[PDB]
Design a protein around this ligand. Sequence first.
Ligand SMILES: Nc1ncnc2c1ncn2[C@@H]1O[C@H](COP(=O)(O)OP(=O)(O)OC[C@@H]2C[C@@H](O)CN2)[C@@H](O)[C@H]1O
Ligand SMILES: [Mg+2]
Length: 327
Amino acid sequence: MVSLAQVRGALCGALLGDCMGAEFEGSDAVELPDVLEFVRLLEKEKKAGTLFYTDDTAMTRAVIQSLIAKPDFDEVDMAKRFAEEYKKEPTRGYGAGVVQVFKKLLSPKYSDVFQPAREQFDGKGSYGNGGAMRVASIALAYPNIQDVIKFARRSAQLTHASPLGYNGAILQALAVHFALQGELKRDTFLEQLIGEMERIEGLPFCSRLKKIKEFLASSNVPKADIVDELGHGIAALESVPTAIYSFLHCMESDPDIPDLYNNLQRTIIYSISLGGDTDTIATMAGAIAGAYYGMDQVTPSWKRSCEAIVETEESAVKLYELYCKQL
Ligand SMILES: Nc1ncnc2c1ncn2[C@@H]1O[C@H](COP(=O)(O)OP(=O)(O)OC[C@@H]2C[C@@H](O)CN2)[C@@H](O)[C@H]1O
Ligand SMILES: [Mg+2]
């Protein structure tokens, strides 16, 4: 079964990904030398908590507080927490679309908490990665895969009504789910994901998962190819597969990252190096890596730099107890 180290690892990895990623958000300019330089500077900063979190963590904290409060999953409670969190701290770096959902949820006009999301972008719904960026904790709370799928979907559908948005969230939740389940081989991990997403989609996400397989069978794949084929975007389709690739790639040495950085550190460094939506791709790859390698790879020097590290650790313990209760 899942250990405390794994739940702690997942959440801290997600926080690190968000906080460190934020440095480089929306940049066509990022290459690995800058990330390594940034990390060296980070690891000798005298003050703790210099890196502030973004919408990624803010929404993550709301998910977690909903699961703890309503462990059978209460989407009305979760929507309320998203909307109140936004209201309290609107400048955290939210999507331009999703702001309209929060205001609609805060008004007394909607009895149906899914309806604001359905109305997004001319009724097509958002295909953004905001559903996925906050979903890891679903997989940390619910052992059963069928729960992980349905609750990933519903948590996502509060903001992301498009199949790309909510299926992106399911994929990210499944990636954490399967990373939790033993030191599972690379090839087993992927088989599991492709299997599930083929059933769920039918295939955009499956297509990208197959590309990941291809890339992982080659060596020294340029980052240009990864960005071209997988993306580094705010779209779920162009970020969730990318996060998964970053996790899988960094299970082995990358010749450009010193091997004195552990696998989780490597994963975060590599993720950020891909550019674009650096906070979300790194928060997602970091959640998966955290679940896989556990808290042993979340180094004191790194975690101390993050806003809300203590609260995050505390919430990991609470999530672990929820998980244990569900067995
Ligand atoms: N269906 C769509 N049609 C046109 N544009 C879309 C559509 N769906 C999403 N987008 C674009 O994607 C952006 C983000 O989607 P939203 O639902 O607003 O927000 P969300 O996915 O939470 O944003 C995640 C980002 C990740 C970082 O940029 C900060 N937060 C929108 O403001 C649009 O620009
Ligand atoms: Mg962000």
